[PDB]
Amino acid sequence: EFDDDLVDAEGNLVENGGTYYLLPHIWAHGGGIETAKTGNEPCPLTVVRSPNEVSKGEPIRISSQFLSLFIPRGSLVALGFANPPSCAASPWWTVVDSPQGPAVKLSQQKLPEKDILVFKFEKVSHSNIHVYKLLYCQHDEEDVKCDQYIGIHRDRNGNRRLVVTEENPLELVLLKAKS
Structure with a gap:
């Protein structure tokens, strides 16, 4: 291929x-990705978008299932904070079901790879800069199917939570961070 x-x-x-x-992608739609403490969480375990348009948010490690130097776009990826809240057991995002639908969260325990290698970037056509949508990939049986997008849900407190969305998937540009 x-x-x-x-x-x-x-x-x-x-x-x-x-x-x-x-x-x-759109400058006016907020900043980078961060964490917040929501619901009954004991500490910041909710993944959210910063409301500060100038904020780059946190540096995020993007890792594919492969050893390769780069990432083929149809690759599944895990996404993790380079510097996670102290209470998370690892940096990796995971997706948790809920009454309102699947939400993007951090975990207080280490998860198996099949619970974190659950994302995929999907190229957006009609763009000059490389813009991607973010898919969530649920189990199909003995595999995985990437058929749901991640979007934003602003809660009653203003947190812009990353959750599985039906409409208005979010769109990202990936800016290399200083190491």
């Missing part, structure tokens, strides 16, 4: 295992 690797905001291939800021 043709790998068609993920490309960062500056036109360079995304490095596998590298750290990037996950910024909105």
Whole structure:
């Protein structure tokens, strides 16, 4: 096939295992990704988008299921904070079901790879800069199916929570962070 690797905001291939800021395509739609303490959580375990348009949010490690230097765009990826809240057991995002639908969270325990290698970036056509939607990939049986998008749900407190969405998937540009 043709790998068609993920490309960062500056036109360079995304490095596998590298750290990037996950910024909105549209400048006015907020900043980078952060965490917040919501519901009955004991500590910041909810993944959210910063409301500060100038904030790059946290550096996020993007890792594929492969050893490769770059990331073919049809690859499943795990996403983790380079510097997670102290209470999370690992940096990796996971998706948790809920009365309102699947939500993106951190965990207080280490999870198996099949619970964190659950994302995929999907190229957005009609764009000059490389813009991606973020898919969530649920189990199909003995495999995985990437048929749901991640979007934003603003809660009664203003947190812009990352959750599985039906409409208005979010759109990101990946900006390499200083290491």
